[PDB]
């Protein structure tokens, strides 16, 4: 995917963030766009194709990827990382919007702006970590049995790939945990 | 697909336009054709190859794709997203055929183009919301009995990653929302 | 495909192009490159592959693909864009010889030129607006019945996506008749 | 494939090149790599996938397929492309190795380079163009009959899109005549 | 995979880079980004596709690629380009800090955190080279034995291209000590 | 393959450069990167796909592959494309850091290290001609017998597209003597 607009904008938002802020934006573009990127999208690449399951019934095997993997986890992680932008783009504008007033002529409201966003920075990520956890928990079992229809019975359906998945799987969290740290310090430093 | 050329004019627009404008065109690019290229291209990919129907009659699996899918939703976003579009087009001419009489040499006429532009918008919107319903409904289901020439009496035939082409159908209908929501705050804000 | 330099050169002309000769060229990037690039190509990605014959012959699937589609409608819409924009190219040619034989050292030859260049536009974009209506009219339907050798008899053949072929040959009509009136619209223009 | 660099050096040298010069590279840029890049790739893709023939031997379509196309016919025009424009590079590098030599201080030699520059394009387009029609003709037929080891006797292939291949064989066969008529006019020019 | 980003910083802390440091960063480029690029992930392409076992059971193929591949080559010198980077980036974020309170307003506490990550970059290294050999060997043979269930008993497994992808790790692993032996010259030459 | 950055470089040593030296470097974007990426890759594309066995021997046709060929063509030149440029990267750097020195504060030391990098450069080019020599000879045979484990006595294999390698092989092998002409005029123009 082309993520050169979302990139521009967050350069230029680093203007006008924290020490924190900016390691938190370079993490996002190296540690999450770019693992996708090169990384990821391969590894996921062939999850339906390779996905096999043992009958000869049709349809078997797309209902029983369907419901294996509701939402492909690097679609999932593309939702988290524009939803987790999302308030940084908020936060430029306003600093923006009241550039162009003043040319028209970080404390008060932009402050409580910006603090604002930390914190819907921080839901937006334990929401879409929670949510992953119940999904998928954290690791990807090969074997997938499958009980819905047309399958007769329960069927064994084998997953491609899932080590390297898990490995890129626990690699994401980490990377999420430690935006999420970055934003605590955010605050604490903001606090101090 | 490449959008420079629309994003450079949609950019250039973005000098002339109200701040309720900006975040409309912000929350295009971010969350419409972002979310196209990186991830829902991804998804519709396989769509009539792994289409499969149970049958052995040549031919019934293309009568059948065609039948249910007669577009493709990746394809109707992208419609939608070039004729919403178009309207800060004509917009952004007007203004800069103004600018270039000037130069030869938002109230009054611009500011009654403006409005009817964002008039457009919504229709547009509210037409293109209300074909996808009439269409798909919003919920894709895997089992589409087909019962079109040359396929003998009814078939079953089984949808690829039927779940998350939903997820996705609603994101996108919640976003197109959001969207008709600004243009509405946006003639509010005018009135004011 | 990269259009990259025929939409410099098509930005170079648009500085000395009229009112309507944006909008046209505009409605070229637009509605006819970015729909090729977006959202046409993908419907004919897999026009032979599932391109599909009900017959045990070797090769009848190819030479019925070949009869049936001479040539693929992407590709005669590429001839298309060419054609037309190759006129606006003889125009910016002109002008900026004329500039630099100036600096050496809408009027008159130039105008009548731009007039020429429009009449050319004009003829190509009806030439091949007939030339696609007597090759496939303006409907692609399902079924081929095709008797080329090596076939034996006539063979029922299955074409791929016929109702969303069907429906972008449409949109593509309109937008050329759209075209063709602006130009109609340019020579009103100029006549006042 | 990736022009950017042999752009960007073709375009330094139209400042320093002839009307005709400039419509001959546009003519280039537009005409040639523009439909290699846009249409004929796409064209040639699936040729050896789509050769079939007529046998249950092993390896027979491989050695068939090579026979038939020694080299495929896009390969070749890259090749013509390149060669046809080296001269160009020829001469803008002179030209560049005596400004940079006034800066330490089109006649005469230059200009002798430039008629020699221009002859190098004329005998590489008449070769290019003499070879290919040697090669192939300038008409794909769609059967091809094999005699080559391992297949067992003559063996009937059938290549893919023969229609369309012709249909783009000849269009570049009318560009590289264009391109020649060209080169003549430059040298009449000149002469005038 | 887009290293563009990427690619800027470290152009950026070239500027604020000693000599070795500059080579260092060349050698990261032109020899590890460009390698994977250009040649390795064409040779890594087919892994799984091509990857082949002697049996007829179900998922066996898929259980024993990803025993054997836990974590395909490519995806782990990603991952060691960025860890290996990512020190760079924390060194030049401290320079434009430094660069940006002074603009309010290589020696000392700047010096010190130019050795750390000097000292970070080689535990990286070192870090990556012990787990490949530990993962991996040096050389990857074509034939794998593998007992992992669904498959019944010992099956031979057949890897793709095994001879090609032994050159490419051997030759990755001779760039990264390269590399190693460039920060033991940094840090030496720091010392005289 | 992306080559920006090593274009980029190569470009700023074009200014520091000999005249023969800007011949040699734009022959080698031309005719050695633009025609891997343009044509070469492309006829490579199909390379183990397309090879064929005659054989029910699981893993025989991998085996063969991986012996007939143990490293690709595309991927040797890419690594010869590399090595003979690093000793332009070597020369610019020494270059620049003289600037930079001057800056603080071809004759001599530096015209040493250029005399250098030409010797380097003729060594790395004849050592890719006499290595792909023994490793193929210049002639790609159709036929290739295997007689490699798992296979079951001499196999005989069919390669794709041997002509048009062969082809694309001799083109290859013609562009490094060239260059290597030019680096011996090279060293005859700093004689003189
Ligand atoms: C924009 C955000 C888009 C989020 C899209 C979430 C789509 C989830 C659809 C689930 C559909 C479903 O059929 O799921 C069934 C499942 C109950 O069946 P199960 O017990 O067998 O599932 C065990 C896992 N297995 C099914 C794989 C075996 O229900 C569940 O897990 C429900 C889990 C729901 C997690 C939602 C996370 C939202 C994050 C919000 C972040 C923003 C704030
Ligand atoms: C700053 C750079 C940090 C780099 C850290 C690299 C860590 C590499 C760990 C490799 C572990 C291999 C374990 C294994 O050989 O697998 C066999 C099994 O293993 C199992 O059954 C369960 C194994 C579960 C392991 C989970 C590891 C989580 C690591 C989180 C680290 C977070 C750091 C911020
Ligand atoms: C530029 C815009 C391009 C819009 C292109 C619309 C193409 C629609 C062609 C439909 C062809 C057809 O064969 O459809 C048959 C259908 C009646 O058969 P059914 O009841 O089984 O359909 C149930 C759904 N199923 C068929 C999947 C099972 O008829 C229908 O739904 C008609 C629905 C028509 C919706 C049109 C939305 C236009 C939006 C305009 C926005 C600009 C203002
Ligand atoms: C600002 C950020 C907002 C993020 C919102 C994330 C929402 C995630 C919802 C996940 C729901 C999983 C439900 C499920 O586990 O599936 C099981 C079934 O479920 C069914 O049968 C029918 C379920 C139908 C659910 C439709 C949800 C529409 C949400 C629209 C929100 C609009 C916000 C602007
Ligand atoms: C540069 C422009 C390139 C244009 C290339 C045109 C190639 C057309 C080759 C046709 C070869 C052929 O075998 O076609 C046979 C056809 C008579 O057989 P049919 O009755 O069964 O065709 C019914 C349709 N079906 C065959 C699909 C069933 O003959 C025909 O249609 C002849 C139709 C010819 C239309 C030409 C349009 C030129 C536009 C020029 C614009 C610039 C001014
Ligand atoms: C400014 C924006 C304009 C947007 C216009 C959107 C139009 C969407 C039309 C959808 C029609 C669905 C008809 C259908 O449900 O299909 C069932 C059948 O239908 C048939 O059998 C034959 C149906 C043939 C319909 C041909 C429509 C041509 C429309 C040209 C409009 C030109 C505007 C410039
Ligand atoms: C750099 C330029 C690269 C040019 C590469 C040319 C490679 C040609 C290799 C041909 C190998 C061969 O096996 O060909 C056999 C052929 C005699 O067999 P045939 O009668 O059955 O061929 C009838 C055609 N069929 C075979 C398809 C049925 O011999 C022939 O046609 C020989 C034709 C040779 C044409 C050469 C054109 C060179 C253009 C130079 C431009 C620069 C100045
Ligand atoms: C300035 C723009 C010019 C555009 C010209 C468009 C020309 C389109 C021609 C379409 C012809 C269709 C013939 C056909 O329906 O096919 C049936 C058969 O036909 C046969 O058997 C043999 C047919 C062989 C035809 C060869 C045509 C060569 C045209 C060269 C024009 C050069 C112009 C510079
Ligand atoms: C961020 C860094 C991400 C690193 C990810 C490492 C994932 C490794 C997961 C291994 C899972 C496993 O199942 O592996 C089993 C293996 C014991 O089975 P085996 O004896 O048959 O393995 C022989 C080799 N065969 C299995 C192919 C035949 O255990 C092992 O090799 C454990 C080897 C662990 C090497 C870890 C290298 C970490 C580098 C850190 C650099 C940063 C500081
Ligand atoms: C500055 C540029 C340096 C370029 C160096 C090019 C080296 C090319 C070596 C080619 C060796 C072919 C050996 C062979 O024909 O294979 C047959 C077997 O061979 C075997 O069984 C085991 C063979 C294992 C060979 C391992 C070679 C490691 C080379 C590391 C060089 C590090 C330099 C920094
Ligand atoms: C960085 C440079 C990377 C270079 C990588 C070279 C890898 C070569 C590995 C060969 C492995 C092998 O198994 O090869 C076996 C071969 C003896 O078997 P054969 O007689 O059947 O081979 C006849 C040819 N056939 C096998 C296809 C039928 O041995 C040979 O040819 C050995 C040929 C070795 C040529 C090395 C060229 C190095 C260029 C250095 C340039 C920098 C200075
Ligand atoms: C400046 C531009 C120069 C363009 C040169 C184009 C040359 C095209 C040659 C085409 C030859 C076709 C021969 C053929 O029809 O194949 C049949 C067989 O042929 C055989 O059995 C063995 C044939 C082996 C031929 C090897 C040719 C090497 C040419 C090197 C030229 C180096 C120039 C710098």
């Not at 934006?25 to 999208?41: D, K």
């Not at 399951?53 to 990827?65: A, F, I, K, L, S």
């Not at 988290?80 to 999302?86: G, L, R």
């Amino acid at each position: 995917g082309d993520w050169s607009f979302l990139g521009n904008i967050l350069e230029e938002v680093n203007e006008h963030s924290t020490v924190i802020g900016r390691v938190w934006l370079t993490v996002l573009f190296i540690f999450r766009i770019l693992i996708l990127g090169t990384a990821a999208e391969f590894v996921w690449g062939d999850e339906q194709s390779d996905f096999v399951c043992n009958t000869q019934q049709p349809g078997c095997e797309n209902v029983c990827y369907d419901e294996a993997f509701p939402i492909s986890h690097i679609r999932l992680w593309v939702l988290q990382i524009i939803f987790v932008s999302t308030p940084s783009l908020v936060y430029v504008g306003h600093a923006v919007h009241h550039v162009r007033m003043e040319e028209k002529r970080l404390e008060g409201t932009l402050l409580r702006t910006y603090v604002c966003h930390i914190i819907f920075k921080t839901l937006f990520e334990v929401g879409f970590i929670v949510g992953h956890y119940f999904l998928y928990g954290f690791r990807i079992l090969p074997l997938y049995r499958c009980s819905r229809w047309p399958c007769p019975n329960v069927v064994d359906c084998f997953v491609s790939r899932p080590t390297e998945k898990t490995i890129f799987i626990l690699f994401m969290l980490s990377v999420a945990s430690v935006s999420l740290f970055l934003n605590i310090l955010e605050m604490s430093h903001l606090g101090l």
